[PDB]
Amino acid sequence: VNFQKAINEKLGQYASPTAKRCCQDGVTRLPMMRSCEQRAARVQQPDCREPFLSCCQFAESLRKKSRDKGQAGLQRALEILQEEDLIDEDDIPVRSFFPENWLWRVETVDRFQILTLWLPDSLTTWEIHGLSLSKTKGLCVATPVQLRVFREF
Amino acid sequence: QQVLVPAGSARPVAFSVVPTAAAAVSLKVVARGSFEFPVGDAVSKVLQIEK
Amino acid sequence: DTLGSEGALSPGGVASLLRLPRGCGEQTMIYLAPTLAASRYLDKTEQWSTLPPETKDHAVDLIQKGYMRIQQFRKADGSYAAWLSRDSSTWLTAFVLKVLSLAQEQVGGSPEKLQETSNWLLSQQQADGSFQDPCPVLDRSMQGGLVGNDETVALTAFVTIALHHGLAVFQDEGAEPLKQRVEASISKANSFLGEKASAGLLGAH
Amino acid sequence: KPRLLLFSPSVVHLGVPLSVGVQLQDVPRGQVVKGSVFLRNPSRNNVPCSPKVDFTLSSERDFALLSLQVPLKDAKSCGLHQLLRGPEVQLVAHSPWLKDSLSRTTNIQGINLLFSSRRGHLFLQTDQPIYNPGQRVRYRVFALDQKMRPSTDTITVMVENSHGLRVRKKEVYMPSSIFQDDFVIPDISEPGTWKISARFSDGLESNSSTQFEVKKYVLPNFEVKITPGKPYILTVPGHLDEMQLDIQARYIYGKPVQGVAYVRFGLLDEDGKKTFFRGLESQTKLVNGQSHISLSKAEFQDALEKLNMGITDLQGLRLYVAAAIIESPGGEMEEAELTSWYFVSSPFSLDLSKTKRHLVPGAPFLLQALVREMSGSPASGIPVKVSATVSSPGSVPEVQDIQQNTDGSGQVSIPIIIPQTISELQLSVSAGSPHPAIARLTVAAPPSGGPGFLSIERPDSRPPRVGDTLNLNLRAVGSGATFSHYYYMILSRGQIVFMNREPKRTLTSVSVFVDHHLAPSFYFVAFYYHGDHPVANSLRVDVQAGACEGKLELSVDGAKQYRNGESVKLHLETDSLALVALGALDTALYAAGSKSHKPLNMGKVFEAMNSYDLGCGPGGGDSALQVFQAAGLAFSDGDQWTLSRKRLSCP
Numbered sequence A: 001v002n003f004q005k006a007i008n009e010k011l012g013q014y015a016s017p018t019a020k021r022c023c024q025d026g027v028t029r030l031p032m033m034r035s036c037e038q039r040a041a042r043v044q045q046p047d048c049r050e051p052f053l054s055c056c057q058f059a060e061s062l063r064k065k066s067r068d069k070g071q072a073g074l075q076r077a078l079e080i081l082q083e084e085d086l087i088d089e090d091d092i093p094v095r096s097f098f099p100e101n102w103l104w105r106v107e108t109v110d111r112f113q114i115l116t117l118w119l120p121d122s123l124t125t126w127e128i129h130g131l132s133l134s135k136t137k138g139l140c141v142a143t144p145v146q147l148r149v150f151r152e153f
Numbered sequence B: 001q002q003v004l005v006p007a008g009s010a011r012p013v014a015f016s017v018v019p020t021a022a023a024a025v026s027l028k029v030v031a032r033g034s035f036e037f038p039v040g041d042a043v044s045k046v047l048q049i050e051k
Numbered sequence C: 001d002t003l004g005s006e007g008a009l010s011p012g013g014v015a016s017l018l019r020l021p022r023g024c025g026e027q028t029m030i031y032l033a034p035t036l037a038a039s040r041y042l043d044k045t046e047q048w049s050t051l052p053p054e055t056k057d058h059a060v061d062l063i064q065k066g067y068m069r070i071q072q073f074r075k076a077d078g079s080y081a082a083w084l085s086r087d088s089s090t091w092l093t094a095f096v097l098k099v100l101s102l103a104q105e106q107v108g109g110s111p112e113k114l115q116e117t118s119n120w121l122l123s124q125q126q127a128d129g130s131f132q133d134p135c136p137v138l139d140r141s142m143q144g145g146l147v148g149n150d151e152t153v154a155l156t157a158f159v160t161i162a163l164h165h166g167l168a169v170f171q172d173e174g175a176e177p178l179k180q181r182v183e184a185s186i187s188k189a190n191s192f193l194g195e196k197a198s199a200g201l202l203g204a205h
Numbered sequence D: 001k002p003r004l005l006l007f008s009p010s011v012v013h014l015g016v017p018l019s020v021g022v023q024l025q026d027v028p029r030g031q032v033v034k035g036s037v038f039l040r041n042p043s044r045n046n047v048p049c050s051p052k053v054d055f056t057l058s059s060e061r062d063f064a065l066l067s068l069q070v071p072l073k074d075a076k077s078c079g080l081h082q083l084l085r086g087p088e089v090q091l092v093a094h095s096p097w098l099k100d101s102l103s104r105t106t107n108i109q110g111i112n113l114l115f116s117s118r119r120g121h122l123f124l125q126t127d128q129p130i131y132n133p134g135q136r137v138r139y140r141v142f143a144l145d146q147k148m149r150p151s152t153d154t155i156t157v158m159v160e161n162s163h164g165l166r167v168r169k170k171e172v173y174m175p176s177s178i179f180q181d182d183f184v185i186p187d188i189s190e191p192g193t194w195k196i197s198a199r200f201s202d203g204l205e206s207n208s209s210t211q212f213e214v215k216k217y218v219l220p221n222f223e224v225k226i227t228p229g230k231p232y233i234l235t236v237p238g239h240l241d242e243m244q245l246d247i248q249a250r251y252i253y254g255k256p257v258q259g260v261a262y263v264r265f266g267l268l269d270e271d272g273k274k275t276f277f278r279g280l281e282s283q284t285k286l287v288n289g290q291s292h293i294s295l296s297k298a299e300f301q302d303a304l305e306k307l308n309m310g311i312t313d314l315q316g317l318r319l320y321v322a323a324a325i326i327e328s329p330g331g332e333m334e335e336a337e338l339t340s341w342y343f344v345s346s347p348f349s350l351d352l353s354k355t356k357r358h359l360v361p362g363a364p365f366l367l368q369a370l371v372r373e374m375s376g377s378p379a380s381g382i383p384v385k386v387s388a389t390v391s392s393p394g395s396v397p398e399v400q401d402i403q404q405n406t407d408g409s410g411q412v413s414i415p416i417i418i419p420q421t422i423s424e425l426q427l428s429v430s431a432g433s434p435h436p437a438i439a440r441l442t443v444a445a446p447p448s449g450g451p452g453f454l455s456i457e458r459p460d461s462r463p464p465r466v467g468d469t470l471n472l473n474l475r476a477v478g479s480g481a482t483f484s485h486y487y488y489m490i491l492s493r494g495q496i497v498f499m500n501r502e503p504k505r506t507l508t509s510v511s512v513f514v515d516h517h518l519a520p521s522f523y524f525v526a527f528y529y530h531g532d533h534p535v536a537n538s539l540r541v542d543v544q545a546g547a548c549e550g551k552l553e554l555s556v557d558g559a560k561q562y563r564n565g566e567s568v569k570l571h572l573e574t575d576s577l578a579l580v581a582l583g584a585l586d587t588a589l590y591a592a593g594s595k596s597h598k599p600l601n602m603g604k605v606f607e608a609m610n611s612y613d614l615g616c617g618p619g620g621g622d623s624a625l626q627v628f629q630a631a632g633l634a635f636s637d638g639d640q641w642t643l644s645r646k647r648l649s650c651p
């Protein structure tokens, strides 16, 4: 909590979105342990380097000062945990992967027809939609019908 | 191997194996519920083993 | 064997036979330039009947796959970058024009976009007549010295070859305004290549 | 005194028939007139556009509803496709009677119309709404004509990426009227919204499109729910509701997640801007995989003052709740957000769009409103009161306080009587209790020296079902004319579908039989003539939620819970032999948090069929000349002209 407030307080010193993005990249910890000034020399824009260097220096100093302090409790053991990361003010990631649309087809149906189908496995219930195209009677949209697939074991 | 799985829970089962072949082996794990419960499932996958 | 059903016109094309990762933008033309050359050989020799008839479907699928992938690298001003959100490369923009000029008919491409592409290449021509790239994809000319002389000449010759293939796109709309500019740009660059070829000392490449 | 009336839809669509209405009044008892009406180019040598439909009008059959074919090939020969200054053409009626009895200088009479290449109906859908780069995407497009019957015409289908560049372009002529195509999104693609657009090959501006989102791969390890205590926040001077929420985290099989939840609060603008409260970020540990978070009224007002805002400054914003749940054993985290916590002034909302906004002096004014409860549209049984300030010229304004309870789908129709001497009407509508939704409207009266008015009265204002008979009352008001008949016509989907006359009685009632041709909404236009001046008024009637011609029924018999792998049988039943296009979509992508681009339904089909409706208003009636424009028609009697639309839009 205290780490989030201080980093956001440092971000509040930069009003431009270019400065915020350059600062947000600075507080993010690189996977390999490169020195902050050594890391800050890479960025190609000096107008981006100045806020990047200041935020990277403040983030590393704050992170090491707060290091080894967390995980309070009555126990005398110390849990090993990675350094706190900034929780982004960028948009959160909504789920994007969904099972592929089986039964995506068009079938010639005379008055009525029954389809024998094999159900792919999943825990989410799905609904089946339908569109009827008749040369004489035209388009019709079927009402959705629910099919809940579940697993006992 | 007899494993008790609580309701609404997950339980990993540890099997030990070491491949001696040099091609590819399809291994199949079979799980069947004891007593009069017909529950059970089987998974078969190919393990690519390299030199 | 190289261009047939077991070669460039395989269902996966030459991209699966070359056996290298193709994440970069220039590598997209491996779906295009080899497939186009394979079609040119079978068209001019009338040899499609020997191969199974599904090869023509394999060919158009590969070309449309390359066109669909390479257009993701297109910049707003008609240039192309090596990677997405990367600076524009003069060399890669030329390579795209050299290949997509032949393929646009069968993939449903737009001649207007290729006319916009060649106009950007013309804006990169210097006063001498040579073309210049702020971030070329290929450097190549190493071990052998005088790298600036070889790179500028090789880049200029590569752009002119690309601009000549781009002349096939133009119709009556661009015959007067744009076609005259490209032909003059090719002639201006050929004067640069002519004096550098006459002066000699150019690398083998 | 004798005159010929010509009205037609304001824009003609090339390739589909244009319904033309011709009518004449004040003719001798035994008069018979004949002529032809056709489209012609207003430029060049005024070349007629080929087809001419002839009319024969008698004193006993003074009206005719004609169908002008207007084929595409003759539109190119006419030269309209070449264009010049604007996409306009003129429909002209040629008859000797113009020079023979009206003595108009020209033997031709017509009005200018815009034209459009848009025709038919094109429906297109993808197999999923959200994709990832590298996934194949299947899409299919359906081609239908104006009458909602399958069309076999050639189409061009094109796909553009997020930046608007075509990645595919294909041309296909399609028997059976369904075309399916596959392609694979390149894995290096930038996330965003791609768009697939399909149009008829000849119709340049006949495009219909569907769009989908391509975004980077993300699959949460465990489900995270942010549940507010109340789905909205009431803000009234001196009052603010509880503002409480629950946070829930459990694995998919059921076991709750052991971890800590980091919740932060802010304001979400309707444009999308997020402004966080720096001091009110909260951290709570999960118990049974759940947590209950409460933000007090004192903390909230302190938060607003921290960024220099007050409770009065709230203006439809949303309280933004962003929660990050970090697992304690593993350390990995999942995030969620709540974007639907609106600040509202009432638990109800008023829809006043059906009000005429045009007065008829000396006739009841119908106040029409729809009350919604935000969660759903139908708020039934809610008292809605209207305070009507009738501003008379000179004398003190008089107030009418009328109220009624909403019913059915939350509709209300409150008659407000207005005298014949009125300057303007100011309405104040209050719906709901204890905190009412308010809507205030001001209507100006038509000019005082008008040649009379026409009042179209409707007894029961409930939407009729397909097959019901609707009775409408015609009531002339004002100085009164010497006319013999009322003339009325039905406009549906931008075309004159019906036209008839009704004799003048002390009380004249018109019975309209609403069939499938009139769904989902149709305009009723009626008029009479008073001394070479037309007097007209119109009313829009919405048809109740319709149904298909025939039926398509899907059913899975018995219990619909099935296990993995085992077979499942689906029953398909339809009225005729037909192509049944199916599709199975997961309920997760269609959930509340997802801007899902909802799939097709009968509402989308009816709304698509209504895209050719030209009505830019709810009835009009300020001037008899432009009440036909407000219904979507262009009209001329030989003495006055319709101005013709500036664009195919409603300014």
Ligand SMILES: *[C@@H]1O[C@H](CO)[C@@H](O[C@@H]2O[C@H](CO)[C@@H](O[C@@H]3O[C@H](CO)[C@@H](O)[C@H](O)[C@@H]3O)[C@H](O)[C@H]2NC(C)=O)[C@H](O)[C@H]1NC(C)=O
Pocket (backbone or CB within 6 Å): B006, B007
């Ligand atoms: C089905 O599986 C569940 C989970 O393994 C079993 O729950 C366990 O039940 C035992 C017996 O009730 C619990 O032990 C008891 O705990 C209470 C405190 O809750 C303590 O006062 C007793 O002295 C005793 O130690 C055990 O805690 C519980 N497991 C967990 C994780 O809480 C359940 O018993 C199984 N069903 C049957 C019929 O055995």
Ligand SMILES: *[C@@H]1O[C@H](CO)[C@@H](O[C@@H]2O[C@H](CO)[C@@H](O[C@@H]3O[C@H](CO)[C@@H](O)[C@H](O)[C@@H]3O)[C@H](O)[C@H]2NC(C)=O)[C@H](O)[C@H]1NC(C)=O
Pocket (backbone or CB within 6 Å): D205, D207, D208, D209
């Ligand atoms: C069929 O294609 C036409 C041609 O593109 C589509 O018209 C276009 O519609 C969009 C959406 O309304 C217009 O963009 C909008 O412009 C306004 C005014 O600048 C702006 O405020 C909006 O934010 C939005 O950007 C676009 O201008 C318009 N095209 C032209 C040439 O005016 C039409 O929507 C398509 N129809 C279907 C059913 O796909």
